[PDB]
């Protein structure tokens, strides 16, 4: 299941993934809370994202 970013997000920690609205993301892990570990299919980068900034596709 891929997700699409609904907003831009600028990294706020060294472990975050920055992304732009419309980027497509794969969830690597969502077991730890509302911050999900994701991989950008667009940019190739990996990191945590706020789960309320994305929607399923």
């Amino acid at each position: 299941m891929t997700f699409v970013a609904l907003y831009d997000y600028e990294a706020r920690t060294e472990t975050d993934l920055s992304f732009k609205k419309g980027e497509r993301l794969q969830i690597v892990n969502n077991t730890e809370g509302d911050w999900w570990l994701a991989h950008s299919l667009t940019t190739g980068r990996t990191g945590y994202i706020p789960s309320n900034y994305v929607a399923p596709s």
Binding site: Y7, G33, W35, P50, N52, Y53
Partner: peptide, 10 residues
């Protein structure tokens, strides 16, 4: 934009 969630707890 929505408020950010609290950071994950262990």
């Amino acid at each position: 934009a929505p408020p950010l969630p609290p950071r994950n707890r262990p």
